[PDB]
């Protein structure tokens, strides 16, 4: 009562629950990017649908429309900043060509694996959730963290991590305590 903290959904279920083409394609993405559940794909689907819905509305307007100029600039700025689109493509029409792998390639889990800090995408997932990856000296434990292009060079092992410049992990520490007792 009298609480005005807003909240909204970030994903939707597919209209057809059992479509073999969609099931196989989503199984490919889950295995390829190490996703926990289909909800992560559907969250990406909603993000894309909102971006394309915005783009389609703007592309309807005349090219000199002030709203198209302002929001079209913002949409392109966001896509370039987060790495969804390359800097070569600057027209609003290229937002409509974005696909699910484009966003999934920008997740911290994929970026960590591609950067060589992890042997696999599954190794990357556990490294992130175990407080081993830092973006600009900030520990990030969210696999779905979308990495900006500017922050991509600042990804490394956390200074407080055993793999960075921190103390030894649990198994080494417990082994040392057992050795001291023994």
């Amino acid at each position: 009562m009298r609480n005005y903290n807003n909240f909204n959904r970030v994903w939707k279920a597919p209209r057809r629950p059992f479509e073999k083409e969609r099931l196989d394609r989503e199984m490919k993405l889950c295995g390829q990017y190490g996703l926990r559940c289909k909800r992560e794909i559907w969250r990406v689907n909603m993000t894309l649908s909102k971006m394309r819905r915005t783009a389609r509305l703007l592309l309807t307007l005349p090219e000199n429309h002030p709203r198209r100029l302002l929001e079209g600039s913002a949409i392109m700025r966001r896509c370039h900043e987060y790495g969804f689109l390359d800097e070569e493509k600057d027209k609003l029409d290229y937002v409509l060509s974005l696909t699910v792998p484009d966003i999934l390639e920008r997740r911290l889990q994929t970026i960590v694996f591609k950067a060589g800090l992890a042997k696999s995408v599954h190794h990357a997932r556990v490294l992130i959730q175990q407080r081993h990856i830092a973006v600009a000296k900030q520990i990030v434990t969210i696999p779905s963290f979308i990495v900006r292009v500017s922050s991509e060079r600042h990804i490394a092992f956390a200074d407080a991590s055993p793999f960075g410049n921190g103390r030894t992990g649990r198994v080494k520490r417990v082994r040392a305590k057992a050795a001291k007792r023994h």
Binding site: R2, Y4, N5, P66, L69, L70, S73, A74
Partner: protein
């Protein structure tokens, strides 16, 4: 009747966060309208940051440390409004409540010898007992012998000390004007013409410094000078010129990148 003011129902210009509380300080009756004022508690706490909460605001205000129009105001629900001079002599603060070009309250720092001067717009003229002419201003002042040339809509230049009128600015074409209501609140332009509609709202057509045309109702304008160059008051940073939204966004992005 009504003693409370829900924070959602409070004016948005007060910059009160919806999650901080259910209520807002309800302005008392006074110089300014409830919808067109800024209560002292908001000024001393949410804007000047001198008080961290309402308890400290009461400490400051009920001591008489805050002067409005050269008078100690001990009520945090006192409605301060447009052209009011706020002084805190112990900290050397002197502000005038103005509207920025976005229609929000701005605290314009005042020097000495100009915090003594307040511009008041004449809203009504009448005759009191003994056949004395009285001019009622936008801030509730009643002046018992104004300039004989004073008309409704004119601005009286007033000295808060000595309680004396010092000048009169008439509401005519070509005069500098600031808008105190509507979508154009805070903008400054010259009166190119006034469209008169008897029994209804008169329309004033204005032209800012850049040459852009805009219009408001005649009740929303406030004569502030002979011309745009000669203003009798000190205005905020934007000088009343509304920048293009797209141009403003690009400039802010460039400035942010420059600091980075």
């Amino acid at each position: 009747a009504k003693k409370h003011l829900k924070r959602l129902y409070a004016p948005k210009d007060w910059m009160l966060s919806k999650l901080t509380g259910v209520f807002a300080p309800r302005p008392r009756p006074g110089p300014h309208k409830l919808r067109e004022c800024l209560p002292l508690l908001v000024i001393i706490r949410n804007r000047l940051k001198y008080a961290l909460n309402a308890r400290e605001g009461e400490m400051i205000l009920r001591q008489g440390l805050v002067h409005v129009d050269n008078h100690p105001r001990r009520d945090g629900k006192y409605p301060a409004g447009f052209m009011d001079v706020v002084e805190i002599p112990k900290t050397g603060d002197r502000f005038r409540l103005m509207y920025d070009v976005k229609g929000r309250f701005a605290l314009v720092n005042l020097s000495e010898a100009e915090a003594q001067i307040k511009l008041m717009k004449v809203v009504n003229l009448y005759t009191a007992t003994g056949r004395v002419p009285v001019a009622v201003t936008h801030d509730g002042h009643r002046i018992r012998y104004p300039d004989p040339h004073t008309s409704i809509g004119d601005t009286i230049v007033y000295n808060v000390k000595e309680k004396k009128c010092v000048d009169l600015i008439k509401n005519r074409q070509g005069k500098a004007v600031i808008v105190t209501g509507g979508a154009n609140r805070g903008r400054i332009g010259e009166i190119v013409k006034v469209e008169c509609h008897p029994g209804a709202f008169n329309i004033a057509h204005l032209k800012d410094a850049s040459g852009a045309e805009f219009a408001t109702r005649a009740a929303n304008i406030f004569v502030i000078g002979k011309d745009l160059n000669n203003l009798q008051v000190t205005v905020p940073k934007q000088q009343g010129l509304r920048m293009n939204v797209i141009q403003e966004r690009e400039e802010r992005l460039i400035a942010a990148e420059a600091r980075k």
